[PDB]
């Protein structure tokens with residue numbers, strides 16, 4: 195009859211990557227089948243005062259602590275790979291460094307369980323590290339991989355920061371696409387997007403005075419979110435103190451809604467994408483963070499991005515709109531902090 | 535201090551996707567009474583499987599695409615735009631043996647699987663431009679039912695991977711006047727460093743730009759556009775190459791090796807597709823052992839794929855084991 199994206203399969207475009215996502219909204223459904231940590235761990239290599247696998251001892255830190263990855267995948271003095279135009283087998287040089295960021299000394303407190311003051315210190319540390327690395331490397335990538343579903347055997351809450359001498363794949367593509375949009379539209383892509391989402395609200399999950407978190411229109415993972423500042427901001431280092439303290443609040447609310455969804459510590463991979471330190475005019479950029487969680491149906495039922503998804507294109511069953519509604523239905527106060 | 539790809543991190547380019555990969559080299563019964571895919575059993579839907587022999591193909595009971603979905607409104611919005619999507623999905627049971635995976639089947643049985651892939655591709659290609667034959671194997675890929683099977687999806691459009699591969703192959707052919715993967719197959723044949731399986735008409739290698747630890751690319755030595763174009767000799771040899779490749783993967787850690795695999799051939803879009811070269815990709819998640827796997831998360835989802843073992847080391851490791859399944863030895 196008449197197309198209704200709530201009922202009919204369709205593909206949605208991702209303007210940041212130039213790819214499409216296949217949405218299948220009313221898939222036939224299968225038959226109903228039916229329905230604590232210590233604050234300090236003596237063996238934890240990330241805990242304060244402990245010795246790392248390498249022998250280096252961690253200080254008796256009280257807030258965040260950043261150290262160079264003992265097993266860094268990149269190094270700052272790597273020799274250059276030879277120049278090649280080989281259409282089939284070619285390589286390029288790679289230099290960088292990697293650092294681990296302990297969010298706090300408490301071995302059992304994840305982001306939504308930390309206070310706004312503690313979260314503000316984390317943002318302060320992300321800014322300091324990004325400013326320092328940006329002086330030498332054009333691309334700085336702050337990220338966090340959380341949970342065993344993501345491959346983490348050590349639950350100590352922490353993130354990582356990688357610096358690259360080149361623009362990795364996602365960055366170069368987001369940079370190009372954003373540039374094109376800006377050249378034609380004269381406004382940054384994501385700033386216009388924030389405006390549209392604020393007028394709509396159907397995909398909104400968290401809204402604070404300076405931040406907006408939505409399940410993007412083009413979301414690929416079930417409960418994936420995109421966190422963006424409401425004003426035009428190029429890098430994390432450019433946030434005003436007010437935007438910074440507010441970011442800590444948005445993060446706390448966003449991560450608490452994720453943990454309340456299934457009443458469990460929700461795994462995900464998250465990272466910040468900001469203008470590169472390449473000396474160019476980067477007005478086309480908009481600082482933003484992506485959150486990519488694997489869980490789909492329960493604290494134990496996850497989405498496996500395989501087969502058809504790896505050979506052709508990502509496919510999803512729950513729409514971005516339904517996912518946002520589910521995230522808005524729970525509380526924004528972490529279950530462990532609320533007396534419920 | 536000379537640049538040494540064996541010691542120094544570096545990036546390698548993937549000509550099929552136009553993306554770089556970062557390398558840091560310094561870093562069960564035959565019949566199950568409850569199985570929905572078993573011969574003579576009933577499915578969720580109450581439909582009953584025939585006592586099939588060989589392969590068995592049926593329309594997926596929970597298909598994500600339908601053939602008659604109404605079209606979506608045309609739109610050129612640069613931010614929020616959708617497009618129509620039609621198609622179908624079918625499940626392909628490899629054999630009635632609930633416990634025999636690809637490496638454990640006879641070359642004759644595998645040849646029947648290839649013939650089915652060809653029949654299903656020809657049939658669906660009359661209506662759809664893209665036909666995707668694939669296989670998701672193992673609990674690590676989310677497979678609850680170990681009954682060996684694959685799936686076949688048809689789309690009214692070219693999915694992301696197909697679109698990109700078609701365009702990059704087309705560009706290369708315009709400039710070189712030769713198909714990208716035909717050239718690549720000839721170069722690897724002459725090298726050997728990344729070769730894992732070589733038969734009369736096929737070659738399987740750990741591609742130079744491999745992203746997953748023991749990922750392989752299986753290609754015909756001659757220029758072939760689609761699976762439906764293989765001669766009978768090529769088809770029978772394909773069965774043997776598949777038995778050898780999959781046998782090597784299972785012998786690596788001596789366990790049923792999980793992977794997701796799929797064929798990419800020229801689309802049925804009525805154009806000149808001489809630029810294409812039929813190929814299959816094998817993307818296995820295991821890395822160090824039968825339990826220790828590779829997670830493509832964090833840095834990789836936010837920037838680019840990273841690998842610790844080089845393509846040359848992974849190929850050397852696959853070449854070191856026997857190509858006869860450990861249970862047939």
Ligand SMILES: O=c1ccn([C@@H]2O[C@H](COP(=O)(O)OP(=O)(O)O)[C@@H](O)[C@H]2O)c(=O)[nH]1
Nearest residue numbers: 570577578579593594595596625677678679
């Ligand atoms: O009655 C049925 C049962 C299953 N399937 C499909 O067949 C495959 C396997 O189903 P099963 O429960 O055996 O394993 P699972 O899909 O859950 O790993 C999947 O493609 C299902 O979508 C189907 O089409 N009809």
Ligand SMILES: O=c1ccn([C@@H]2O[C@H](COP(=O)(O)O)[C@@H](O)[C@H]2O)c(=O)[nH]1
Nearest residue numbers: 239246247248263264265294346347348
């Ligand atoms: O003594 C140690 C232990 C771990 N790590 C690093 O911290 C992260 C911890 O995560 P994982 O490997 O425990 O999963 C990794 O990137 C790892 O290399 C160190 O740098 N030093």
Ligand SMILES: [Fe+3]
Nearest residue numbers: 210368467484
């Ligand atoms: Fe981004």
Ligand SMILES: [Fe+3]
Nearest residue numbers: 550699798815
């Ligand atoms: Fe391909």
Ligand SMILES: [Zn+2]
Nearest residue numbers: 238241301350
């Ligand atoms: Zn700890």
Ligand SMILES: [Zn+2]
Nearest residue numbers: 569572632681
């Ligand atoms: Zn079975």
